[PDB]
């Protein structure tokens, strides 16, 4: 389960990376 | 400690996968 | 290791929120 946790971590953590670019540009665009 | 780690984790995910869906609409309608 | 994963999530957490904020602000100027 540590890995398990880790691992989701890490996905959440490409997942806001990825949601953030996608909101800027959102941002840029109106 | 670990169950309540797995219990934020799956709760962040699940708000990452709704904002992701409101993003899309929003692309949609903006465009380009 | 445990600990390390604790600051991770509480720093996702406040992203999230902050993200919540932005498309709630896009939401309505799109509409």
Redesign the interface.
Known sequence: ??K???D??E???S??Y???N??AR??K??
């Open positions: 389960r540590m398990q946790l880790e989701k971590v996905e959440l953590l997942k806001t990825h949601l953030e996608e909101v959102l941002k665009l109106v």
